[PDB]
Ligand binder design. Sequence first.
Ligand SMILES: [Mg+2]
Length: 337
Amino acid sequence: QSRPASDPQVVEAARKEGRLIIYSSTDQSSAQALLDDFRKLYPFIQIEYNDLGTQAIYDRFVSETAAGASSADLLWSSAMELQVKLASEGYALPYDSPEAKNWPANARLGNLAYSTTLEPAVVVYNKRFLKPEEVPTTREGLARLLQEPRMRGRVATWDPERSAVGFTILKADYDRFPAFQELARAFGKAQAALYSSTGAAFEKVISGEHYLAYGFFGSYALLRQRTVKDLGIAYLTDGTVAIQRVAFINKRAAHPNAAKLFLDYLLSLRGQNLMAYTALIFARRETVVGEATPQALYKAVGGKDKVYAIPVSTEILKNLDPAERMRFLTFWRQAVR
Ligand SMILES: [Mg+2]
């Protein structure tokens, strides 16, 4: 492919920095090919990739900043509310990425933070327990399946009280899809187990302890499928929540220029193509080729109209308002117990 269009003076300043600290919720097993390809472009950048939980990224970054400590150069996290909160509160370096000129307004927070992905919340299942034909592709259908005695104890979904991105996804589902309330009651009926990481849910599904998991990232499911033939993916045809993994540069980065190079790389055709084709991370750009693409998602759900892309906007900070959080979690807690 190409090289990202970062200014040659940023490249020279990144070479004097020589180092890049990343705090990321992107599982290293998915991120690795992007780190490897970024090092081929810029081998003089020593990367410290910190694979961390979404809430752990926000708590660590805020304390280290409060203490005047060494923190990250770049934060990359699926917990969209916590990224937007930081980037709208003075923590972000303002930077107009020359790779984001065609980003729509709802995929960027001006010059403070950026969408890097369009990642669907999907259904995964174990083909030894559920044939593809048995797996409903709507919230109503899934709620009916979860009335079956045989499904009791055989469902996984997020714990929105322990995963900040589990909150992002289930809260967006709750806000947009009336059918979600009926589904959440069916989670209660089926005694759903609640997980705070995708791999923990997936291993239960792979072992057959659960037959089906709702709401986890299509990205991770596609990569896991390469080595697990019995892992099925179903896309919701009544409406799919998509998260946009948000990246921003630490205003107090020790290596701002190295962080600019990495952000430009993530947004570039080269980076987005590597996401779609090799990392199997569902890319933001619609001009990418591979399995993990907007066009493959749109085809699976029956069109772009059936995707609800959570915007990279301070409007989503509504979800952290105390009364709003209380309404959703009081509903959730009652439905699922
Ligand atoms: Mg992760």
